[PDB]
Design a protein around this ligand. Structure first.
Ligand SMILES: C[C@H](CCC(=O)NCCC[N+](C)(C)C[C@H](O)CS(=O)(=O)O)[C@H]1CC[C@H]2[C@@H]3[C@H](O)C[C@@H]4C[C@H](O)CC[C@]4(C)[C@H]3C[C@H](O)[C@]12C
Ligand SMILES: [Mg+2]
Ligand SMILES: [Zn+2]
Ligand SMILES: [Zn+2]
Ligand SMILES: [Zn+2]
Lengths: 149, 91, 1345, 72, 298
């Protein structure tokens, strides 16, 4: 019934039907694919020693907990070098600060944590979580109008 | 009679799993229907044999009270027999 | 019409009278012409005809033959309603054991015969034999046998030997037994011989036997001979669409029974070998047993759908039987639902109602009125007129609607204000516009919540609704007299914005001729709504006897307050509106108006508050903008310093100066402190930040930041939510309760990035999940509590008693947690309240302590009143009005007829929804107030140090001031070194007790010689020597170390005097030889006399839960296994045998019988000295005290005070307000079973449990008679156990196990008298509670007359 | 009210009575002890400076917490 | 939920004390389950498909393992020597990291730690930087240990002391008469390397492979007479048949990943390697190096 620190980029953390079955009908995130086995995987930019390459790399859930993944909102100096020394990352569940030369992967784009429903909300980052949940659920019931605007 | 202290275990816990009621059974029951009937007799007096850990934080006692000693008698007796007297077909 | 309902066995004779002919064949219909086939499961001639007044022949199709039975095919020309009341019998070829009396646990054929269930189950399924009057040869009557021994003893005897098998045997047994015979034989051989389990079970059996004799039953009617069949229309075979019939399983089951019955009959005709007929009998028995209660014993027969098909019990018993859904909750006519909207234009006694809804719910009213006014000739013409909806139909509608109030109800009816009744204002629309103030009660809001309107038809119903349920009649929460009409959010913010004041607004300073001039300026535009001003207001007061005397003055107010003054009624001071009017002030305004001007002016005034509030919140234009969520500017500094803190702790961790858990704790600690600091920075920046200037420089006033206004008016919001808008939103928790170590240091005004948002998601979804579950399990507490307390009703005006309880201010830990004015308000005083010097009888002894009397109490500073309680009433089967109090939902007093049990359960289950669902947790005695000492339960010694060391146990210090009332509570620990004495003068700053928790004295009374009497060093002593001080300590050890040389000996540290004789302790024949427990810090070794109460021997060394489930357990009355062991009797304590775990402790009286032993498990640290003469109802083990013990020792009043305090504290830690009558009435419903201390002159078994009213009526009847009656012992059961044992069976079979209650009430011939509230709802008569109380009374005097 | 309005208070009680027990494990009193109450080692000055009133050396505290972690 | 091996805790909700139990299921895509449940007294109990619980090492014995190599698998060794004077011991200093010495830790003739001391990291560095390679302690330090393997007489072929034997003074007494110099006890600490399989041996009713298969068959389908190779057949088809039991390829991936196997794919049938790796990972989760699985973990 609840979210785990490996839902990141695989299952929407906010978009669920509130009511009787919360967290059982979790909806898929934007870039989430399924592994060759059946496991969900999400992309990550391969970041070698200090440069964030634009070759992407689909990590599954069992593997992502053995890498220092970057943060989607991490600046870059026109070449793929983080313009901070330390950089926000999430190594094993607990997020943290990690030095420049430790990140193993970066995130593909910042909408990769939320589902298609909860990505049409502007200013999602200024809302209570449950408010965005109710918001996605109620966007999913909108009746088409005469003149769609 | 490990059955008899199985009953007291299920009481002093307030619940029984299928694990416990598979542990403290008679080792000689092969006809599953006997297991069915006896777990029903257990639940009839308390305590209800759910299949897992829960009742952890559910503090709700409809199992009073004359049924308790009678059902304990029936359980203590089920070992004295081997069945079945419940299926007409097999009889 | 009728009266009590009798249930019992049914003979075969009575069953043959019930029927209208026997069903022989198993066929239902005729498959091509679907006439019900004769004469089977749907027989026209047995179970009535299929068409109204038409026989199945076709020959008789007119009413003119109504009543003749067609000679061609036998049917009786009648109504096919008759096809729902006839029954038919099935002649069983062999007898059959009724599975209910067979396998109910306890088996009634079993313990009516005293035969084990296994043996009857053997004889039934023919695996055995059983003798019945086995001649005068060898075998007792009940003797089982088998095939083998049977055929053997038959060689012995062909006659004088009767061993049957199967239901024939059990029947010949049941009939051959003699109830009077075995009952009196058990009498004899239980009288002349008594043994514990023997007398237990045998007197149980004789109870059952004489119950069977007292009833009209017969012992063998448990064994079916004729079987009845339900009427067809109750088990129909309805034709669905497409020639695909639908039936109920009962047709399949009846087919299965009739088939095997016929097959058995044919076998018996053929004279088959008894193997096959045995299998046939067993098959028929399984058929009947699956027809009666399928799934009971033998793996229920499954229908054609794979499914275990239902039987008669499953149509009765369980969650789905009759008793539960259609017998309690039904779909009801004249009813509709729709979406509620606001409609502020209303009064609070009306509700909008759409013309479509109104015209449709009110059809027969309009029809009758259109044909009464002549607007329509017939009723058919009236229907046509309405369905065309003509211009006069609407006017006739508005004529009908006028005074007919409609009931409005919402989905989760959590309490009795969930149903109210309004007058309908027709509303050209489609939404039920519900008045705003009422949404508090209904718990409603306008985001889609549907409400359901019901119409009351009769005149008694309209008068109930208009007199008992109108929305203007319930402005007080029935949980507590505080009103439920408090304005919520638009209106408190409008009222707040009005009654405020800038520091320099328009039109400031000017003085006004009154409030009318205030509005004449404001609307004109010459004064801001809050610009301070002097205005002349004339406020009234009801100081005299109903004389509202005016007093005028020039008050210093604002334009807003004076404009709002025009809506306040007369008798209210201007001080009520000269404040800033948040939500609390705007609630207590309504509250004072109720306490002064009664109810009508309060409803009018509340409507006026709402109108003026909406109007001036509209005029305020008070929006919210993103520029209003002002971040502080010292935020980045606070966050930076907290980050430096966590970096330094992490650095210390990297240098091995801390564990992991402690680095984590310090991180969470510094983050909590930084979060609090940012909250404070923002609130300081935001509350006063309006900085204005008048005739000069500058001056900071409270802010007008609209977010702050809505948070500070109590309109919407608080410190925390703006902490999340402006400050940082703190530490977010994952759902286990373990807080994440990095906090979101941002707000919602600045975004959260992806990680911080993903972190808030955890706790957010946890909270969402726990409200989506907390709702679905909503009325479980209220429902569980009305099962126990439903049948309770205020049934007498006064019971004339002087019992009661001593209501007192609650003072726990420090100071008062609630005054006496609350806990006494509107309860009847039991005995006279005298003044402090007692001076006269001040408060008479039957005075309804309303607000004047609460004032007149606190104006003499009383802190203890003997108030009548519900639980200590005297009336049987009810409660007298006075010993309950006043109906806090109506104000005046309880009436004869209020079903206070239901409203108590509701008043505890409603506020139970504001308590969290999952459960929940949490040096010296320095004076801090001005007052004077008072030590309670004190027995001390003033040692040579001049200090005080109290030798008692229950000694604690309370603070009593100039008036006498208790000021503060504190406990005085044992040997708490008191610098003061007792009762003398004190001030705040002189620590009254200094005591060291390291040591618990053995304080002597005498400054005498030490003496180690009975102290064997090495066998009763341990040779301790602390070489720090070099301390010669002959310490005493427990009974867990030393040898058997002094094992149960007693190390006695005694103070004798300075010549060598033992100093007797003053009062008894024991010198002061304090026998030593183990582990004692007995520093001083012998030969050193010391002060009167030094620590010669020194003993070595408030969590509260809060869930609603803590309430459920508080009521279930469970014995926590860490229970304080009270003292079964006052008197000299003493120990005994040791080292069993169960160690002996016994208390001897001066007078009574001494020997009472109790085995204290040695896991618990004992807490009473060896030779202290102990009180009654003391404590030895300390911790949880089981309430059962509190009852059995301290009495009823002590257990009620305990449970009331437990529940009240669980509700008070969140601030939920609930009265005491409710917990008291539920507690009275808890202790309503008693058992007798002496069987006495009455007709009661010794250890039998009977309802306390039964004992107390019989004993009153007996001591009014010659003898003296039973000496009872009150008992206490939980709600879940007390609501099981109840008197009716129609009631207690609705919600209990149906089969067990029905079988017991059947065997016992228990005729139910409809005098409860569940029964009279099931049967469908008037409840005895409310309006129906009068009818039930006058019908109770019709009979008995 | 609504789903989110009560869910807020459920989460808020959760967070508050989760902060408070982690913050109550913190020692705020003052009584220097100088000797780990299990092993008698001298608690160094610095590890007594961070948490005043700490009555265990870091080694014994790590042991006791490792033991706590399995609920023994 | 995918096939594979899962480790869960059942945290503080069955026992009264609150101690957690740390079971370790093995669910295959098709076949028979296998569960490994501790008990409140820290006893490994393997229960094949959900019926009655059995002691742990009975399945190991059915794998044709006996007690000595079982202890060699599930433990480290400690080697006491009769150094001509009251049984002095082999020592490596990092083992002791968390000890409370019942003696005077001394080498070079030099007391490293006074007796009674909770063994410190300080004395750790002292030992190895000074490299203590054999210590001497009193005899009641070996008085309560357990012997690793078998021990039988050179006199009459009689048992010195059985494998997995609690120690005493007479046991070392008879070892001296046997001339034994290698006391193989185990390294069991309350904190990290706890004794669990040892006590589970103590509770094991059976002693050899045939007894184990007898017990297993009596549990699987009771009533029928057992038989040596009949029980052998039942067991070796229960989790070793290509026909019956199979963790599919995803099951094998989850398995070889949940134990940190270098490979990623293999058989569809279990092995001694697999069940022993499972038991090891379980007891090392109990020790405190590892973590139970979150169920919702995607
Ligand atoms: C959220 C909830 C209101 C729900 C409506 C309120 C009502 C009672 C509050 C707790 C208790 O006071 C005990 C304790 C007091 C401490 O001082 C601060 C923390 C504690 C845990 C409080 C947290 C929270 O504030 C509670 C749960
Ligand atoms: Mg709503
Ligand atoms: Zn006819
Ligand atoms: Zn009364
Ligand atoms: Zn230590």
């Amino acid at each position: 019934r609840d979210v785990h620190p490996t839902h990141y980029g695989r299952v929407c953390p906010i978009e669920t039907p509130e009511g009787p079955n919360i967290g059982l009908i979790n909806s898929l995130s934007v870039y989430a694919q399924t592994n060759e086995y059946g496991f969900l995987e999400t992309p990550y930019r391969k970041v070698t020693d200090g440069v964030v390459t634009d070759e992407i790399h689909y990590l599954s859930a069992i593997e992502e907990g053995n890498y220092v993944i970057a943060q989607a909102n991490s600046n870059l100096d026109e070449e793929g070098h983080f313009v901070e020394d330390l950089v926000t990352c999430r190594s094993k569940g607990e997020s943290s600060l990690f030095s420049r030369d430790q990140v193993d992967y970066m995130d593909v784009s910042t909408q990769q944590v939320v589902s298609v429903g909860a990505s049409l909300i502007p200013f999602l980052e200024h809302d209570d979580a449950n408010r965005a949940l109710m918001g996605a659920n109620m966007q999913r019931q909108a009746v088409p109008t005469l003149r769609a605007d | 009679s490990q059955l008899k202290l199985l009953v007291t275990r299920g009481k002093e816990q307030g619940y029984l799993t299928y694990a416990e009621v598979n542990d403290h059974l008679p080792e000689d029951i092969v006809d599953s229907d006997q297991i069915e009937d006896i777990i029903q007799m257990i639940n009839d007096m308390g305590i209800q044999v759910m299949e897992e850990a829960p009742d952890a934080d559910d503090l709700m006692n409809t199992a009073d009270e004359d049924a308790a000693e009678a059902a304990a008698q029936v359980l203590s007796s089920v070992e004295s027999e081997i069945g079945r007297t419940t299926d007409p077909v097999r009889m | 019409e009728f009266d009590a309902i009798k249930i019992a066995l049914a003979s075969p004779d009575m069953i043959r009278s019930w029927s209208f002919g026997e069903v022989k064949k198993p066929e239902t219909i005729n498959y091509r012409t679907f006439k019900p086939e004769r004469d089977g499961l749907f027989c026209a001639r047995i179970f009535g005809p299929v068409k109204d007044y038409e026989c199945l022949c076709g020959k008789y199709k007119r009413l003119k033959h109504r009543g003749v039975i067609c000679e061609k095919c036998g049917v009786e020309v009648t109504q096919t309603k008759v096809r729902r009341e006839r029954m038919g019998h099935i002649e069983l070829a062999s007898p059959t054991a009724h599975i209910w009396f067979l396998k109910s646990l306890p088996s009634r054929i079993g313990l009516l015969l005293d035969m084990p269930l296994r043996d009857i189950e053997r004889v039934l399924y023919f695996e055995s034999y059983v003798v019945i009057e086995g001649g005068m040869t060898n075998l007792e009557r009940q003797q089982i046998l088998t095939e083998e021994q049977y055929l053997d003893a038959l060689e012995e005897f062909g006659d004088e030997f009767d061993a049957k098998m199967g239901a024939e045997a059990i029947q010949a047994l049941l009939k051959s037994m003699d109830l009077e015979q075995e009952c009196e034989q058990l009498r004899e051989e239980l009288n002349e011989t008594n043994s514990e389990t023997k007398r237990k079970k045998l007197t149980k059996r004789i109870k059952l036997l004489e119950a069977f004799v007292q009833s009209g039953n017969k012992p063998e009617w448990m064994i079916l001979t004729v079987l009845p069949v339900l009427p067809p229309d109750l088990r129909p075979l309805v034709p669905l669409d497409g020639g695909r019939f639908a039936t109920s399983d009962l047709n399949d089951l009846y087919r299965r029974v009739i088939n095997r019955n016929n097959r058995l009959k044919r076998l018996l005709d053929l004279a088959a070998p008894d193997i096959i007929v045995r299998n046939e009998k067993r098959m028929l028995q399984e058929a009947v047993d699956a027809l009666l209660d399928n799934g009971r014993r033998g793996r229920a027969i499954t229908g054609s759908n794979k499914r275990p098909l239902k039987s008669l019990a499953d149509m009765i018993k369980g969650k789905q039987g009759r008793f539960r859904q259609n017998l309690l909750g039904k779909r009801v006519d004249y009813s509709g639902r729709s979406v509620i909207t606001v409609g502020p234009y209303l009064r609070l006694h009306q509700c909008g109602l759409p013309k479509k809804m109104a015209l449709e719910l009110f059809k027969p009213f309009i029809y009758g009125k259109l044909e009464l006014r002549g607007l329509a000739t017939t009723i058919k013409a009236a229907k046509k007129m309405v369905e065309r909806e003509e211009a006069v139909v609407w006017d006739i509608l508005d004529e009908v609607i006028r005074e007919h109030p409609v009931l409005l109800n919402r989905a989760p009816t959590l309490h009795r204000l969930g149903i109210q009744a309004f007058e309908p204002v027709l509303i050209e629309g489609k939404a039920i516009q519900l008045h705003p103030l009422v949404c508090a009660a209904y718990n409603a809001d306008f985001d889609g919540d549907q409400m359901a309107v019901h119409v009351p038809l009769t005149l008694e119903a309209q008068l109930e609704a208009r007199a008992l349920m109108m929305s203007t009649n319930n402005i007080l929460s029935p949980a507590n007299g505080e009103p439920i009409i408090v304005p919520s959010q638009d209106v408190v913010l409008g009222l707040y914005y009005m009654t405020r004041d800038c520091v320099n607004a328009k039109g400031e300073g000017m003085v006004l001729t009154g409030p009318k001039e205030a509005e004449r300026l404001y609307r004109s535009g010459l004064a801001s709504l809050h610009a301070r001003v002097k205005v002349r207001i004339t406020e009234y007061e009801k100081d005299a006897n109903g004389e509202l005397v005016a007093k005028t003055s020039l008050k210093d107010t604002t334009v807003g307050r004076a404009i709002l003054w025009m809506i306040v009624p007369k008798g209210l001071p201007y001080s009520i509106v000269n404040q800033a009017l948040g939500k609390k002030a705007i609630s207590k305004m309504l509250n004072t108006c109720y306490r002064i001007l009664g109810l009508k002016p309060t409803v009018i005034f509340a409507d006026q508050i709402m109108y003026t509030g909406f109007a001036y919140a509209a005029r305020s234009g008070a929006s919210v903008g993103i520029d209003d969520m002002v971040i502080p500017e010292k935020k980045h500094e606070i966050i930076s310093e907290a980050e430096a803190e966590v970096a330094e702790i992490q650095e210390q961790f990297q240098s091995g100066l801390v564990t992991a858990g402690e680095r984590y704790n310090k991180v969470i600690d510094i983050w909590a402190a930084a979060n609090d600091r940012v909250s404070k920075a923002m609130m300081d920046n935001l509350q006063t930040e309006t900085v204005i200037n008048r005739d000069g420089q500058e001056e900071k006033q409270v802010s007008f930041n609209s977010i702050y206004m809505m948070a500070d008016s109590g309109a919407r919001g608080s410190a925390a939510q703006i902490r999340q808008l402006a400050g940082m939103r703190g530490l977010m928790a994952k759902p286990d309760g373990s807080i994440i170590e990095t906090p979101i240091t941002a707000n919602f005004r600045e975004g959260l990035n992806v990680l911080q948002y993903f972190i808030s998601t955890h706790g957010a979804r946890k909270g969402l999940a726990d409200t989506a579950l907390k709702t679905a399990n909503s009325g479980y507490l209220t429902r569980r509590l009305v099962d126990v307390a439903q049948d309770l009703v205020v049934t007498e005006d006064d019971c004339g008693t002087h019992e009661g309880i001593m209501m007192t201010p609650v003072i726990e830990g420090g100071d008062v947690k609630e005054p006496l004015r609350d806990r006494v308000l509107g309860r009847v005083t039991a005995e006279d309240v005298l003044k402090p010097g007692t001076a006269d009888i001040l408060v008479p002894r039957n005075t309804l302590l309303h607000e004047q009397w609460c004032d007149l109490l606190e104006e003499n500073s009383v802190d203890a009143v003997k108030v009548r309680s519900v639980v200590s009433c005297d009336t049987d089967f009810g409660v007298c009005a006075h010993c309950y109090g006043r109906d806090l939902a109506r104000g005046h007093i309880i009436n004869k007829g209020e079903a206070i049990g239901v409203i108590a359960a509701q008043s505890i289950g409603e506020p139970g929804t504001q308590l969290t669902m999952r459960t929940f947790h949490i040096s010296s005695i320095q004076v801090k107030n001005k007052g004077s000492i008072k030590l309670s339960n004190v027995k001390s010694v003033v040692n040579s140090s001049g200090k005080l060391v109290i030798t008692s146990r229950n000694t604690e210090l309370k603070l009593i001031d100039e008036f006498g009332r208790t000021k503060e509570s504190y406990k005085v620990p044992y040997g708490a070194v008191l610098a003061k004495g007792d009762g003398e003068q004190v001030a705040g700053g002189e620590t009254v007790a200094n005591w060291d928790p390291h040591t618990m004295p053995v304080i002597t009374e005498v400054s005498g010689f030490v003496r180690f009497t009975d102290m064997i060093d090495g066998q009763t002593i341990t040779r301790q020597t602390d070489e720090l001080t070099g301390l010669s300590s002959l310490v005493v050890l427990d009974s867990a170390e030393r040898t058997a040389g002094g094992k149960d000996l007693r190390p006695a540290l005694k103070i004798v005097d300075a010549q060598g004789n033992d100093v007797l302790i003053p009062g008894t024949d024991m010198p002061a030889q304090y026998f030593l427990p183990g582990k004692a810090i007995v520093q001083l070794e012998d030969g050193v006399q010391i002060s009167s109460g030094d620590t010669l021997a020194r003993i070595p060394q408030k969590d509260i839960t809060g869930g609603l489930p803590r309430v459920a357990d508080l009521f279930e009355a469970r014995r926590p296994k860490e229970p304080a062991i009270l003292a079964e009797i006052s008197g000299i304590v003493s120990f005994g045998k040791e080292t069993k775990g169960k160690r002996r402790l016994v208390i001897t009286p001066v007078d009574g019988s001494d020997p009472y032993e109790e085995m204290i498990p040695k896991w618990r640290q004992l807490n009473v000295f060896e030779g202290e003469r102990v009180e009654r109802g003391d404590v030895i083990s300390d911790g949880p005290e089981a309430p059962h013990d509190i009852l059995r020792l301290r009495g009823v009043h002590a257990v009620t005070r305990y449970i009331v305090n437990e529940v009240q504290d669980v509700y008070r830690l969140q601030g939920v307000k609930i009265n005491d009558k409710h917990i008291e009435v539920i507690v009275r419903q808890m202790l309503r079973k008693a058992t007798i201390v002496n069987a006495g002159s009455s007709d009661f078994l010794e250890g039998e449990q009977v309802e306390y009213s039964r004992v107390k009526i019989a004993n009153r009847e007996l001591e009014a008679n010659g003898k003296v009656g039973a000496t009872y012992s009150r008992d206490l059961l939980g709600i879940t156990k007390a609501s099981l044992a109840t008197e009716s069976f129609i009631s207690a079979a609705s919600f209990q196990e149906t089969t067990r209650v029905l079988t017991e009430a059947a065997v016992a011939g228990k005729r139910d008298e409809l005098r409860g509230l569940k029964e009279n709802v099931i049967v469908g008569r008037l409840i005895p509670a409310g309006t129906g109380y009068a009818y039930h009374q006058d019908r109770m005097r019709r009979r008995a007359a | 009210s609504d789903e989110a309005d009560e869910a807020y208070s459920v989460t808020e009680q959760l967070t508050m009575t989760g902060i408070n027990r982690i913050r109550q494990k913190i020692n705020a009193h003052g009584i220097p002890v100088y000797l780990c109450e299990a092993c008698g080692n001298p608690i160094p000055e610095a590890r007594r400076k961070i948490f005043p009133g700490v009555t265990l050396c870091v080694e014994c505290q790590a042991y006791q917490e490792r033991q706590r972690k399995h609920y023994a | 939920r995918s096939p594979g091996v899962f480790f869960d805790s059942d945290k503080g909700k069955t026992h009264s004390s609150g101690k957690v139990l740390y079971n370790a299921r093995i669910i295959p895509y098709r076949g028979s389950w296998l569960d490994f449940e501790f008990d409140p007294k820290d006893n490994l109990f393997v229960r094949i498909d959900r019926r009655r619980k059995l002691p742990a090492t009975i399945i190991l014995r059915a794998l044709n393992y006996t007690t000595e190599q079982i202890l060699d698998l599930f433990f480290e060794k400690v080697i006491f020597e009769i150094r001509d004077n009251k049984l002095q011991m082999e020592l490596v200093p990092e083992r002791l990291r968390g000890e409370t010495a019942s003696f005077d830790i001394e080498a070079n003739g030099k007391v490293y730690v006074e007796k009674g001391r909770r063994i410190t990291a300080r004395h750790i560095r002292q030992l190895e930087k000074d490299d203590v390679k054999l210590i001497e302690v009193p005899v009641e330090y070996i008085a309560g240990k357990v012997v690793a393997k078998d021990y039988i007489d050179e006199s009459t072929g009689e048992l010195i002391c059985a494998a997995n034997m609690e120690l005493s003074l007479d046991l070392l007494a008879k070892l001296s008469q046997s001339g034994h110099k290698r006391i193989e006890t185990l390294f069991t600490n309350d904190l990290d390397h706890g004794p669990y399989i040892s006590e589970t041996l103590r509770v094991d009713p059976t002693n050899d492979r045939l007894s184990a298969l007898v017990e297993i068959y009596r549990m699987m389908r009771p009533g029928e007479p057992p038989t040596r190779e009949a029980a052998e057949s039942l067991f070796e088809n229960l989790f070793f048949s290509e026909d019956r039991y199979d963790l599919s390829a995803v099951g094998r991936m989850k398995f070889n990943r949940s134990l940190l196997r270098e490979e990623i794919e293999g058989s569809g049938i279990l092995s001694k390697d697999d069940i022993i790796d499972v038991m090891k990972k379980l007891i090392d989760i109990r020790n405190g190096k590892g973590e139970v699985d979150d169920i919702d973990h995607l």
